[PDB]
Amino acid sequence: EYVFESPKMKEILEKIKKISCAECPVLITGESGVGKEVVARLIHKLSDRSKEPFVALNVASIPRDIFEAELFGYEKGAFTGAVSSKEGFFELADGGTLFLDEIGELSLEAQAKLLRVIESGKFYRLGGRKEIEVNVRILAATNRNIKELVKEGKFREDLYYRLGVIEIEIPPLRERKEDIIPLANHFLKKFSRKYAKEVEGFTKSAQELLLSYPWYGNVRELKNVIERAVLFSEGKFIDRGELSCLV
């Protein structure tokens, strides 16, 4: 029930399918909320590992202190690791997919780590002396400008080219007019079901406005305004008037 219509978005769909069997890093770019996450989840579904686990992880929320430990895991004992060994996120994602959103926020200390992972697929647990090898597909995404961040010295160049093999840039919504209404209608149908309203579709007078709004919030802001509209809707159709005060 996901929407891909515009040529640019349709092109991505084909591109994704071609790499479904690929075991190599992917870097997703675009403004935040252009559906980069859906793309990441889609790659998992269309691959041969689709039946395997899909691990979603926020890398920012991870404390710098335990970062290495929580990712790669740790063995029993070994620096206050209690009496028990515990797996890391990579091992949990073994054979599956690991998705890093907002990867662009990471300490240079931490960025340098994981470097040796991507290509070699090998690492050591904290305090473990036995090398472990795992099979993991790495996916990364950011709403930032990756190209510039390297130049500003906030991101290591050497890491970019490993991750920057394949790059899919979801363009902003304002340049996708064809994808506006189809998305807008789908959400209406969705929110109408959860909140249980009588609403169906949009007036043409309203339809023109949605087109002429250059969506700085992309498809998220879009999803949100409708949720407001559906709640404040009265009749079976939503006019420009109800949205006029909203935009």
The entry of Mg ion, a second copy, none near residue 62 (CB within 5 to 8 angstroms by kind) is a second copy
55/60 Cα distance (integer angstroms): 15
Q: List binders of Mg ion among 6-65 (CB under 5 A).
A: 36-37
Nearer to a second copy by Cβ, of 13 and 112: the residue is 112
Gap between the Cα atoms of 35 and 6, Å rounded = 14
- In the chain, DSSP assigns E strands to 26-30, 54-58, 97-101, 122-123, 132-133, 137-142, 166-170, 201-202, 237-238
Structure tokens at 48: 């041969």
Binding pattern for the stretch 31-70 against a second copy, x by CB under 8 A and - elsewhere: -xx----------------------xxx-xxxx-xxxxxx
The correct pick among 190, 224, 239, 242 for binding a second copy (CB under 8 A) is 224
Should residue 107 be labelled a site residue for a second copy when binding is judged by CB under 8 A?
yes
- Least distance (Å) from a second copy to the CB of residue 204? 26
77 binds a second copy (CB under 8 A): yes
Alpha carbon 16 to its chain centroid, in Å, reads 14
Task: Using CB under 5 A, pick the residue from 12, 42, 68, 101 that binds Mg ion.
Answer: 101
DSSP assignments along 188-228, one per residue: HHHHHHHHT----EE-HHHHHHHHTS--TTHHHHHHHHHHH
Q: In the set 45, 50, 95, 112, which binds a second copy (CB under 8 A)? A: 112
Which x/- pattern, by CB under 5 A, does the window 125-164 give for Mg ion? ----------------x-----------------------
